[PDB]
Amino acid sequence: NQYDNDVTVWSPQGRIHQIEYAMEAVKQGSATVGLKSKTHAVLVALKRAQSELAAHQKKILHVDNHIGISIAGLTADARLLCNFMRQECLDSRFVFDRPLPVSRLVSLIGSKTQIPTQRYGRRPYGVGLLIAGYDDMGPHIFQTCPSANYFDCRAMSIGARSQSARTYLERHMSEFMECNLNELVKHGLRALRETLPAEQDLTTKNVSIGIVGKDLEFTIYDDDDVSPFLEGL
Amino acid sequence: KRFDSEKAGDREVQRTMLELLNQLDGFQPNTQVKVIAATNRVDILDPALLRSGRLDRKIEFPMPNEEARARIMQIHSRKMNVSPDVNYEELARCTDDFNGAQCKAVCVEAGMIALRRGATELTHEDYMEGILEVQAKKKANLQYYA
Amino acid sequence: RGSSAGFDRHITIFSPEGRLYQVEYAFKAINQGGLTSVAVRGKDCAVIVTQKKVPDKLLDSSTVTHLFKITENIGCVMTGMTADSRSQVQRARYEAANWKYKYGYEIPVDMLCKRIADISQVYTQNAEMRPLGCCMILIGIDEEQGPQVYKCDPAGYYCGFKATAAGVKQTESTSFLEKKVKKKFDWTFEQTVETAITCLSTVLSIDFKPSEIEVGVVTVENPKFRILTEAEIDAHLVAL
Amino acid sequence: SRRYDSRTTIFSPEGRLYQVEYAMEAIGHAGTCLGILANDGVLLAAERRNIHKLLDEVFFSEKIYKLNEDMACSVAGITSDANVLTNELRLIAQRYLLQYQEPIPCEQLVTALCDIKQAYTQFGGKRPFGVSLLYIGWDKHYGFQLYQSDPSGNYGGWKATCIGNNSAAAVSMLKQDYKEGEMTLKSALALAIKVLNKTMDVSKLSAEKVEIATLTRENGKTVIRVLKQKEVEQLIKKHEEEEAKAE
Amino acid sequence: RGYSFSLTTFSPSGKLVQIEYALAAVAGGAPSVGIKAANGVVLATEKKQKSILYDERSVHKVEPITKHIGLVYSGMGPDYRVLVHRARKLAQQYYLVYQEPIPTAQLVQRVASVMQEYTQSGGVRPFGVSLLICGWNEGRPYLFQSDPSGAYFAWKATAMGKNYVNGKTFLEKRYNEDLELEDAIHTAILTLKESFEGQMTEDNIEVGICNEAGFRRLTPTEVKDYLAA
Amino acid sequence: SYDRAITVFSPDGHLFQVEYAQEAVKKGSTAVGVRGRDIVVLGVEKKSVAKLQDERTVRKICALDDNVCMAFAGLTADARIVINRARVECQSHRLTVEDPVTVEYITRYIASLKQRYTQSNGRRPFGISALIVGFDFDGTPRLYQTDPSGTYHAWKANAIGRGAKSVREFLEKNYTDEAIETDDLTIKLVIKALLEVVQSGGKNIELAVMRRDQSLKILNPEEIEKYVAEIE
Amino acid sequence: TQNPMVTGTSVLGVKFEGGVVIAADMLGSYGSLARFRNISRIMRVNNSTMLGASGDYADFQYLKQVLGQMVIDEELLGDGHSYSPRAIHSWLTRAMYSRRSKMNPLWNTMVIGGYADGESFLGYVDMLGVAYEAPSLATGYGAYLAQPLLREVLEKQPVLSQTEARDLVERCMRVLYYRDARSYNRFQIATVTEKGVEIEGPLSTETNWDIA
Amino acid sequence: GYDLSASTFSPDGRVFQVEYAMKAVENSSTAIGIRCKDGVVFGVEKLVLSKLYEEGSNKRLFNVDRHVGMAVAGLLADARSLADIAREEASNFRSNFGYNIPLKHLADRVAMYVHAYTLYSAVRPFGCSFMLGSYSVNDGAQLYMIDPSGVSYGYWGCAIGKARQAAKTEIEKLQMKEMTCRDIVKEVAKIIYIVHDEVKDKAFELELSWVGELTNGRHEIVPKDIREEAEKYAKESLK
Amino acid sequence: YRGVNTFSPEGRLFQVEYAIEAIKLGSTAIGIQTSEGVCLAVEKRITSPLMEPSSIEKIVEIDAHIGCAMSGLIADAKTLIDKARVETQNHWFTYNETMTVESVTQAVSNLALQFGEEDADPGAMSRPFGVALLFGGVDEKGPQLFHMDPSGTFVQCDARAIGSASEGAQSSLQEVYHKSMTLKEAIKSSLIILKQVMEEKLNATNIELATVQPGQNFHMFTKEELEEVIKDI
């Protein structure tokens, strides 16, 4: 009761509750996915609309020509973190005339998210990202949780109902390294479909796709631009 | 724990506690009867009762871990006619912070929902709806989260 | 007598009876280590002795200690919480270095103890932070004052002593030492090292070995604080 | 930390500042203070509480304070907060004097201090000042003046007032026996001696459990004085004689 | 960062309670005395250490501020040390600006004003000490007291600390405005003796004086001589 | 610096500090305002002469600019603070724009200051409500009311403070083009409306009147009693 | 450094098929005074970069410390990414530009050279931030006395080899020793390739024909 | 209410928040450090939460300087912040005094930095314990440890983590004094396998490291071949 | 107790939820997007006759091509309007272009939620803004309608209803509106739904209406123009 009011008050079991509630906020958001092959990395998302007249919320953003993210949780926090990532990438290009290696960006992200969870009165970043990038070491996928704890995944799926998606991903992890771009995108779409609630099908109105690779800047497919990818499922 | 307070009544419970203490390990050693006990709070029990001569072996029972959650669910759903598609690893993963006494709710409520929908055999969605029942969560009238 | 009014037992503020309960508890934490130390003032030598508990054979015994040099001339025992002890020792070393930088001569023991006690007094006035749970004892030779023995506590008390004990067994050791100082002079030779060892052995009832204590000495002939080795300690241990 | 915060600057559920109310409750126990504005003077009459045979006599007074050449004030509440406020008042007077080379008018000053006090009770998280003031002075705008202040920051011009112990009773007689515009300094002093004799129910005016001040204009310049023992005792003898003849 | 809210707040009866508790701590300390003779001012307290292992000369309770003004306390020790330091600093600032020794009334005002700040400032508690200051300024003795509330009082003779009420009764009995320095210090020594719980050895009391010659502590041999009578 | 959040949201969406501010506003003497063809008039209620206060040091209708005035109902210290701030801003406006300030501009400024203190850290909201009246340069009559939440509107006749509901009902039933034709009819209307809470009148009221160029008009007690009589 | 105090003279560099070669005498002069006479002016930044510096030697040593600390830090993370020569060139350009803009120059004209990913690199920076990439470089009086020969031979023959570059460097340094007042006889020459950086000992300008 | 901030002592003289933080460090897996004649050897059991993570996800050995290593157990965010702070201390030392930081001094500075987080209400104690170990020709091999309370003590062998007592009972048998890193490595894997619980946790992949005379004083990940052979020997020993 | 920046056991900032509750106290505002333009309609809610209805400035223009309609508190909007306007003008200053609608919505959204208690500014904002806005305007991309909430969450909508009667109003707007409306038909449907919600009978005096079209700048409907529309309405 009194151990879940501040982020600096350890609970008698060695747990900080506020961080866990922030994790909850990240788990209540709409589903998203990430993959990496030996050649590409593909994010696949599922937007949802408050009503039938409103648009479906954007949930893939640009960071650099070689990095992309996919959010799940409070938007404002996601916007703040996008601002941070983009400023870091630009500073790396200005100082070093070179793309920022992805791992280092994820490390800075973790460190920035760490300060809130150790000072009185500050609160954890209530957003969960899925960063996809392509550095000199090749494709990468990462995950970030409100606790400043990032993970180097080969496939993941955060958000609401994301566990069936994770099951399908762990089910077919062998093929991802050898797949073509099309097969990879179809794996991602199929999992995110496993997440959908029964009588609801994948449509051009509730899907967005991001891709980055060897000779391909990060590009976002949405609306009818996604139809070529969907047609085939 | 005993304490120095002007309010009466608790002294009588303390006093029967002293008597139990003495019965466990005291004059006239008793070596034929053994004692068990269970408590949710061990931070309030008297040191003379957690002493290393009366209550020697103390055993901890942790909130079950993923493997434990799958095991518990499996044990309790053993009688019900379940389909061969339920992935108990999934059901373990989507059941964080679930004390062991909770699949009983999940297992049974999945059966109940199968009855409601006039079914005969259970399916993954039945267990998922059971879980959403057991968590007992309320909405805030809106879903601004992305 | 024991009233409580608000947060008087949570932050360093007065109780209805003019009592600072947080400082009192801090004093209670000095005993959480489980160690004791004694210091004795001789005619031309001042001595500080302390226990040395090697909990098991995986620690490096050379590293676990409670003797430190503030300067080359002033050396101290630390008792209680270890981290707080290190913090206070660092502050003492910085303060002594600054004294010599600013005023051109080495720091008197009493004035260092005064500075450190003032620091602790600030700690026990402001309520944002908590008082440290460690106590000092210092020793060294003054130019025209003879050997000095001084101690400080969490509240900020820095009394100078003729023979002292700090730790879990403060009262028994203090009683023994008071009786001795009553007897003739409280030891009046460099074999004041034997009186301290005897006091610790009697109070703790230990019968020390060579590898279960650490000593520091300062002599008028050799003012530089010296940390008695194991061979010398065994020699003194045999002596009695 | 929110756990230990007192919230000394937040509204209650009926729009009343509680810390302010308690501050005004502290004043109702310190020495009584009296104001009387004559047609040729102003006068402060507070009670000397430090009544012990082992206290020493120091300073020209014990409760009256000078602020400029042409202004003085008396205090009821805490002594230390009194000192702090007096110092700030002196500083305000000198700052106005430095900017304009004219003595600070009286409502100039009283509102500067009360603005400090009000701000202090508006934001900051501190406790408010538990002091209520009485002032006296002359300025070319309104002549002899008598103001009053409170922990809230409100002030008021009073032809006659009372702030402190037994305030209700003192203001009750002051209402019964004040001639608006028909008062000499001497009559005002006698009225003060009478009212205080009532209020200081403990014994009678000992000529030593009292403080009196007078502000006048003499030879074109202000003159401030604190009544000595002989004149005070003579006034009290005159008062008792008048009451005796009256009966 | 540091707490920015006052920890002493008014109560429903309009009483700053923390100051009352500080006063309780002061009333529960060691006794102290001060008298103002016609030709000097005397302070004297009791310094009963807890064992034979304490160096009486290690610390002192009667401490000077300048060559001509000094003070003693009763209450807590560390607070007294802090206030001694602040008083010495304020005295030196006054000397630096004015090139003249600081008058006692002003030093008391200034130290007290420093004492008020901690009753109202944020995240701090009042000092648990009362001081007495003695000076010889303007060819005239001065005796002041200063309490945790920041209030000061000029005293002809006073006694604070444990059993201070009875001490004030004593001194009320024994004040005579035409008193002389030696008689005054003798009367003080007595007042401490009115309640002491033991034998007043030379090494269990302190005294300090002020006159034209200058404030100066009394050496123990002098103390024994005076204690002779 | 003290940096706690005094005013904070509550379940069901209430700024309890704001609500308590207006609860304080409900403990102040009634102030009234009406708007006519060519005259505005402000009416207040004096608590009691007391025969010893100096009513000059107690004023309750104040001028912010030569062409703008204001009356408040609530706490006094907060009223003084807002009045000084508004005065500074009117003078700054004169200096920068070289044209006389307008009533809506200053009402907007005061409302913004109230909102600011309602959304800042370590600050208690003002428990005062204002009634600004005046004529812009165009010579058009105006009346605005500012609440402690930072909201303002324009009115033909509103009463603020103690007993505000009664006086507002009276004005709402009675306000008609007939009662503004003659400046005396408007002054008397305000006097009558006030006379539904106060007791004595004449020695228990203050009035204020302002015209196109005519400066602020304070009605003396004898003239006010004569006006009440003529109403009698 | 508003006023240089102890300075290093011309530094010259030229690239070939498989890397670069840089040369620099070991002399810090205090204004026409060969004060310090055994100080190297060529540094290895990482396993694919080196650095030469002219101008103030204290500034060069500071930049040496900063740049080596940065390299230590990066190798620390061990993520599989290392600064390329182009990265170090950019970092230097921005550092010197910033110092120039803050009116506090870093008195050092500085020749960066490296070889990574099958391509050489050879860059230049100045106290004012002027930077560029060329097939051959020379600082100080070497830009007047030695640059003409390097440029002539490279324009005539676009791609040199290791021994051709070695000989051309030695001729250039001999000319500098003949006609450069603040020069000294002993010098070092560094070479990066697919194997790493390598600084040779104090080679002599032993061939000094003095037919007067 | 005596356990809500680190600025309050319990009535019996304890700072509870620190005790809770140190409790947290016993929920993370086990780490081991063994000092020998040649140098130091760290070995950590890294639990695989899900099958979907990469090899090397959340490495729990770091490099704070080119000669120093760092093993951690507990909250990983705190571990990474403290790794950053130790790196900063090392870089500052090199830039100021012109040489590689002696390890004891680094342990002291890092511990003071941690201890400063266990005095005030405005911050909370780090939920991580860690062990530093380096090697130099002069200072020889060293291995230290710093707990959330900020106490630094040298060690001949230690285990920070969940199964700390079991490893401690296991590490006590080596006689590490008279071996070199090469055999210490096999021992370290042996222990990390002996302590691992297959009933509770699913599976793990070792992270091993060393610093000793075999590295010229450089801390670096143990090479793949040696690591595999060690793992195989440990597997065989667990008959 | 319970700081402003605190996470509920569900994963929702409490202050944000309470701020979302305050939007129900506000009057009902509507907005409809059509190819020929976008319209805003709101309810002035005249409490008593004695107050000038014209003095309720509850629709303001951000730029000649943007419009804003609000619900919630009067006082909370004012700062958000000033921010929106200064951002529009800043963009015009720098790029000599017209600030788009999504961008001004984004800037206003960022300005929300930057509230706290510890280490922010001498006078930074404390509680979240308790107002829900509606931006509608014509951009290079055509008619746009965006909806903002106290959570810093904004989405472009085809028809939205905000305020005390937002529910029910939304069902009506959903039954009527189609993809091929006309501006005038949109005004008619909006005024009809408003009439259907308000307690009082609709009249030209107790509403305001505004439309923005590609040709004409943001337009406020006049009393007579209002009567002209309402008569056939």
Side-chain angles (χ1 to χ4, degrees), chain F residues 3 5 8-9 35 119 154-157, chain I residues 15 50-52 55 116-117 125 127:
Chain F
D3 54 352
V8 86
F9 253 69
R35 207 192 59 208
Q119 199 168 5
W155 295 80
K156 278 158 298 193
Chain I
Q15 290 302 283
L50 281 182
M51 65 164 160
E52 281 65 352
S55 50
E117 262 173 0
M125 289 285 72
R127 48 160 189 88

PDB file of all heavy atoms in Angstrom, chain F residues 3 5 8-9 35 119 154-157, chain I residues 15 50-52 55 116-117 125-127, unseen atoms left out:
ATOM      1  N   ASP F   3       8.906  23.748  -4.299  1.00  0.00           N
ATOM      2  CA  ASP F   3       8.445  23.314  -5.611  1.00  0.00           C
ATOM      3  C   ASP F   3       7.485  22.145  -5.487  1.00  0.00           C
ATOM      4  O   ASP F   3       7.624  21.118  -6.152  1.00  0.00           O
ATOM      5  CB  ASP F   3       9.630  22.968  -6.506  1.00  0.00           C
ATOM      6  CG  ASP F   3      10.569  21.961  -5.870  1.00  0.00           C
ATOM      7  OD1 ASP F   3      10.388  21.643  -4.675  1.00  0.00           O
ATOM      8  OD2 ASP F   3      11.496  21.491  -6.564  1.00  0.00           O
ATOM      9  N   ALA F   5       3.341  20.874  -5.694  1.00  0.00           N
ATOM     10  CA  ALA F   5       2.175  21.180  -6.517  1.00  0.00           C
ATOM     11  C   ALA F   5       0.973  21.362  -5.606  1.00  0.00           C
ATOM     12  O   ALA F   5       0.329  20.392  -5.212  1.00  0.00           O
ATOM     13  CB  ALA F   5       1.937  20.070  -7.532  1.00  0.00           C
ATOM     14  N   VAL F   8      -3.986  20.534  -7.477  1.00  0.00           N
ATOM     15  CA  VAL F   8      -3.833  19.275  -8.192  1.00  0.00           C
ATOM     16  C   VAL F   8      -5.208  18.690  -8.472  1.00  0.00           C
ATOM     17  O   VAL F   8      -6.172  18.933  -7.744  1.00  0.00           O
ATOM     18  CB  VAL F   8      -2.955  18.283  -7.397  1.00  0.00           C
ATOM     19  CG1 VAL F   8      -3.788  17.511  -6.403  1.00  0.00           C
ATOM     20  CG2 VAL F   8      -2.229  17.338  -8.325  1.00  0.00           C
ATOM     21  N   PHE F   9      -5.294  17.898  -9.538  1.00  0.00           N
ATOM     22  CA  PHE F   9      -6.577  17.357  -9.955  1.00  0.00           C
ATOM     23  C   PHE F   9      -7.044  16.297  -8.971  1.00  0.00           C
ATOM     24  O   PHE F   9      -6.264  15.744  -8.194  1.00  0.00           O
ATOM     25  CB  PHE F   9      -6.500  16.741 -11.350  1.00  0.00           C
ATOM     26  CG  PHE F   9      -7.172  17.553 -12.405  1.00  0.00           C
ATOM     27  CD1 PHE F   9      -6.638  18.758 -12.796  1.00  0.00           C
ATOM     28  CD2 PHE F   9      -8.298  17.102 -13.038  1.00  0.00           C
ATOM     29  CE1 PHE F   9      -7.231  19.507 -13.770  1.00  0.00           C
ATOM     30  CE2 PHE F   9      -8.903  17.860 -14.007  1.00  0.00           C
ATOM     31  CZ  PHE F   9      -8.361  19.054 -14.384  1.00  0.00           C
ATOM     32  N   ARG F  35     -24.732  48.166 -16.005  1.00  0.00           N
ATOM     33  CA  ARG F  35     -24.290  48.861 -17.200  1.00  0.00           C
ATOM     34  C   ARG F  35     -25.482  49.557 -17.836  1.00  0.00           C
ATOM     35  O   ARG F  35     -26.503  48.920 -18.107  1.00  0.00           O
ATOM     36  CB  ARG F  35     -23.665  47.894 -18.200  1.00  0.00           C
ATOM     37  CG  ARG F  35     -22.651  48.541 -19.098  1.00  0.00           C
ATOM     38  CD  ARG F  35     -22.256  47.656 -20.243  1.00  0.00           C
ATOM     39  NE  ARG F  35     -23.399  47.290 -21.068  1.00  0.00           N
ATOM     40  CZ  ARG F  35     -23.487  46.176 -21.777  1.00  0.00           C
ATOM     41  NH1 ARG F  35     -22.525  45.271 -21.763  1.00  0.00           N
ATOM     42  NH2 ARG F  35     -24.562  45.970 -22.529  1.00  0.00           N
ATOM     43  N   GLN F 119      -2.024  27.204 -11.760  1.00  0.00           N
ATOM     44  CA  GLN F 119      -1.349  26.071 -12.388  1.00  0.00           C
ATOM     45  C   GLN F 119       0.156  26.029 -12.126  1.00  0.00           C
ATOM     46  O   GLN F 119       0.858  25.229 -12.747  1.00  0.00           O
ATOM     47  CB  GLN F 119      -1.631  26.071 -13.889  1.00  0.00           C
ATOM     48  CG  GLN F 119      -1.381  24.742 -14.570  1.00  0.00           C
ATOM     49  CD  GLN F 119      -1.937  24.685 -15.973  1.00  0.00           C
ATOM     50  OE1 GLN F 119      -2.442  25.673 -16.501  1.00  0.00           O
ATOM     51  NE2 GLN F 119      -1.868  23.520 -16.575  1.00  0.00           N
ATOM     52  N   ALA F 154     -18.498  38.898 -19.998  1.00  0.00           N
ATOM     53  CA  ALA F 154     -19.058  40.238 -19.983  1.00  0.00           C
ATOM     54  C   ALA F 154     -20.507  40.164 -19.539  1.00  0.00           C
ATOM     55  O   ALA F 154     -21.194  39.176 -19.798  1.00  0.00           O
ATOM     56  CB  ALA F 154     -18.965  40.902 -21.351  1.00  0.00           C
ATOM     57  N   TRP F 155     -20.969  41.212 -18.870  1.00  0.00           N
ATOM     58  CA  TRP F 155     -22.263  41.189 -18.213  1.00  0.00           C
ATOM     59  C   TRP F 155     -22.971  42.512 -18.438  1.00  0.00           C
ATOM     60  O   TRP F 155     -22.347  43.533 -18.734  1.00  0.00           O
ATOM     61  CB  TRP F 155     -22.122  40.920 -16.710  1.00  0.00           C
ATOM     62  CG  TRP F 155     -21.587  39.569 -16.415  1.00  0.00           C
ATOM     63  CD1 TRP F 155     -20.291  39.183 -16.467  1.00  0.00           C
ATOM     64  CD2 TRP F 155     -22.338  38.411 -16.046  1.00  0.00           C
ATOM     65  NE1 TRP F 155     -20.178  37.857 -16.147  1.00  0.00           N
ATOM     66  CE2 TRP F 155     -21.426  37.360 -15.887  1.00  0.00           C
ATOM     67  CE3 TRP F 155     -23.691  38.166 -15.826  1.00  0.00           C
ATOM     68  CZ2 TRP F 155     -21.818  36.091 -15.518  1.00  0.00           C
ATOM     69  CZ3 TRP F 155     -24.077  36.900 -15.465  1.00  0.00           C
ATOM     70  CH2 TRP F 155     -23.147  35.879 -15.315  1.00  0.00           C
ATOM     71  N   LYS F 156     -24.290  42.478 -18.305  1.00  0.00           N
ATOM     72  CA  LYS F 156     -25.059  43.702 -18.159  1.00  0.00           C
ATOM     73  C   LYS F 156     -25.248  44.070 -16.696  1.00  0.00           C
ATOM     74  O   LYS F 156     -25.221  45.254 -16.345  1.00  0.00           O
ATOM     75  CB  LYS F 156     -26.411  43.564 -18.850  1.00  0.00           C
ATOM     76  CG  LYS F 156     -26.334  43.823 -20.328  1.00  0.00           C
ATOM     77  CD  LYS F 156     -27.468  43.204 -21.106  1.00  0.00           C
ATOM     78  CE  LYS F 156     -27.509  41.698 -21.010  1.00  0.00           C
ATOM     79  NZ  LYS F 156     -28.432  41.156 -22.037  1.00  0.00           N
ATOM     80  N   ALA F 157     -25.436  43.080 -15.828  1.00  0.00           N
ATOM     81  CA  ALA F 157     -25.533  43.350 -14.400  1.00  0.00           C
ATOM     82  C   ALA F 157     -25.266  42.066 -13.636  1.00  0.00           C
ATOM     83  O   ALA F 157     -26.086  41.146 -13.675  1.00  0.00           O
ATOM     84  CB  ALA F 157     -26.905  43.904 -14.054  1.00  0.00           C
TER      85      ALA F 157
ATOM     86  N   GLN I  15      -3.237  11.651 -12.595  1.00  0.00           N
ATOM     87  CA  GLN I  15      -3.583  13.016 -12.958  1.00  0.00           C
ATOM     88  C   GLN I  15      -4.161  13.075 -14.362  1.00  0.00           C
ATOM     89  O   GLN I  15      -5.085  13.851 -14.626  1.00  0.00           O
ATOM     90  CB  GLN I  15      -2.369  13.929 -12.839  1.00  0.00           C
ATOM     91  CG  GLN I  15      -1.922  14.194 -11.427  1.00  0.00           C
ATOM     92  CD  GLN I  15      -3.010  14.812 -10.599  1.00  0.00           C
ATOM     93  OE1 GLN I  15      -3.291  15.994 -10.721  1.00  0.00           O
ATOM     94  NE2 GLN I  15      -3.621  14.020  -9.736  1.00  0.00           N
ATOM     95  N   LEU I  50     -28.305  37.832 -18.342  1.00  0.00           N
ATOM     96  CA  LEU I  50     -27.705  39.123 -18.059  1.00  0.00           C
ATOM     97  C   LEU I  50     -26.325  39.278 -18.668  1.00  0.00           C
ATOM     98  O   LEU I  50     -25.762  40.374 -18.593  1.00  0.00           O
ATOM     99  CB  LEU I  50     -27.623  39.330 -16.549  1.00  0.00           C
ATOM    100  CG  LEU I  50     -28.909  39.754 -15.849  1.00  0.00           C
ATOM    101  CD1 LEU I  50     -28.649  39.960 -14.369  1.00  0.00           C
ATOM    102  CD2 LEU I  50     -29.475  41.011 -16.472  1.00  0.00           C
ATOM    103  N   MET I  51     -25.761  38.231 -19.262  1.00  0.00           N
ATOM    104  CA  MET I  51     -24.390  38.318 -19.735  1.00  0.00           C
ATOM    105  C   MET I  51     -24.330  38.369 -21.252  1.00  0.00           C
ATOM    106  O   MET I  51     -25.107  37.717 -21.950  1.00  0.00           O
ATOM    107  CB  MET I  51     -23.543  37.154 -19.221  1.00  0.00           C
ATOM    108  CG  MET I  51     -23.913  35.786 -19.703  1.00  0.00           C
ATOM    109  SD  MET I  51     -22.536  34.676 -19.354  1.00  0.00           S
ATOM    110  CE  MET I  51     -23.324  33.081 -19.412  1.00  0.00           C
ATOM    111  N   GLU I  52     -23.391  39.165 -21.752  1.00  0.00           N
ATOM    112  CA  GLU I  52     -23.270  39.345 -23.184  1.00  0.00           C
ATOM    113  C   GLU I  52     -22.844  38.009 -23.774  1.00  0.00           C
ATOM    114  O   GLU I  52     -21.765  37.507 -23.445  1.00  0.00           O
ATOM    115  CB  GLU I  52     -22.253  40.429 -23.532  1.00  0.00           C
ATOM    116  CG  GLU I  52     -22.770  41.848 -23.395  1.00  0.00           C
ATOM    117  CD  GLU I  52     -23.108  42.200 -21.954  1.00  0.00           C
ATOM    118  OE1 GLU I  52     -23.091  41.296 -21.092  1.00  0.00           O
ATOM    119  OE2 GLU I  52     -23.385  43.382 -21.675  1.00  0.00           O
ATOM    120  N   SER I  55     -19.341  37.734 -25.464  1.00  0.00           N
ATOM    121  CA  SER I  55     -18.139  37.764 -24.642  1.00  0.00           C
ATOM    122  C   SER I  55     -17.650  36.381 -24.242  1.00  0.00           C
ATOM    123  O   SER I  55     -16.797  36.274 -23.357  1.00  0.00           O
ATOM    124  CB  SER I  55     -18.394  38.604 -23.391  1.00  0.00           C
ATOM    125  OG  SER I  55     -19.592  38.211 -22.745  1.00  0.00           O
ATOM    126  N   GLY I 116       5.331  18.701 -13.708  1.00  0.00           N
ATOM    127  CA  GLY I 116       6.020  17.951 -12.678  1.00  0.00           C
ATOM    128  C   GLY I 116       6.185  18.784 -11.430  1.00  0.00           C
ATOM    129  O   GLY I 116       5.625  19.875 -11.304  1.00  0.00           O
ATOM    130  N   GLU I 117       6.974  18.250 -10.508  1.00  0.00           N
ATOM    131  CA  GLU I 117       7.169  18.842  -9.192  1.00  0.00           C
ATOM    132  C   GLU I 117       8.627  19.046  -8.829  1.00  0.00           C
ATOM    133  O   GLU I 117       8.934  19.934  -8.033  1.00  0.00           O
ATOM    134  CB  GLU I 117       6.524  17.960  -8.113  1.00  0.00           C
ATOM    135  CG  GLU I 117       5.141  18.395  -7.665  1.00  0.00           C
ATOM    136  CD  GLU I 117       4.490  17.388  -6.735  1.00  0.00           C
ATOM    137  OE1 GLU I 117       5.123  16.356  -6.436  1.00  0.00           O
ATOM    138  OE2 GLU I 117       3.342  17.626  -6.304  1.00  0.00           O
ATOM    139  N   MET I 125       4.707  24.296 -15.218  1.00  0.00           N
ATOM    140  CA  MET I 125       3.329  23.868 -15.017  1.00  0.00           C
ATOM    141  C   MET I 125       3.282  22.680 -14.065  1.00  0.00           C
ATOM    142  O   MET I 125       4.212  21.876 -14.012  1.00  0.00           O
ATOM    143  CB  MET I 125       2.679  23.489 -16.348  1.00  0.00           C
ATOM    144  CG  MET I 125       2.362  24.652 -17.296  1.00  0.00           C
ATOM    145  SD  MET I 125       0.947  25.686 -16.873  1.00  0.00           S
ATOM    146  CE  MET I 125       1.564  26.589 -15.454  1.00  0.00           C
ATOM    147  N   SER I 126       2.193  22.573 -13.301  1.00  0.00           N
ATOM    148  CA  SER I 126       2.070  21.543 -12.272  1.00  0.00           C
ATOM    149  C   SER I 126       1.111  20.421 -12.642  1.00  0.00           C
ATOM    150  O   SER I 126       1.524  19.259 -12.669  1.00  0.00           O
ATOM    151  CB  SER I 126       1.600  22.164 -10.957  1.00  0.00           C
ATOM    152  N   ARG I 127      -0.147  20.726 -12.912  1.00  0.00           N
ATOM    153  CA  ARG I 127      -1.150  19.730 -13.252  1.00  0.00           C
ATOM    154  C   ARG I 127      -1.405  19.750 -14.748  1.00  0.00           C
ATOM    155  O   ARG I 127      -1.192  20.771 -15.409  1.00  0.00           O
ATOM    156  CB  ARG I 127      -2.472  19.981 -12.526  1.00  0.00           C
ATOM    157  CG  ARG I 127      -2.923  21.404 -12.628  1.00  0.00           C
ATOM    158  CD  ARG I 127      -4.379  21.558 -12.362  1.00  0.00           C
ATOM    159  NE  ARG I 127      -4.807  22.909 -12.684  1.00  0.00           N
ATOM    160  CZ  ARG I 127      -5.211  23.308 -13.879  1.00  0.00           C
ATOM    161  NH1 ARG I 127      -5.247  22.483 -14.909  1.00  0.00           N
ATOM    162  NH2 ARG I 127      -5.573  24.573 -14.047  1.00  0.00           N
TER     163      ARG I 127
END
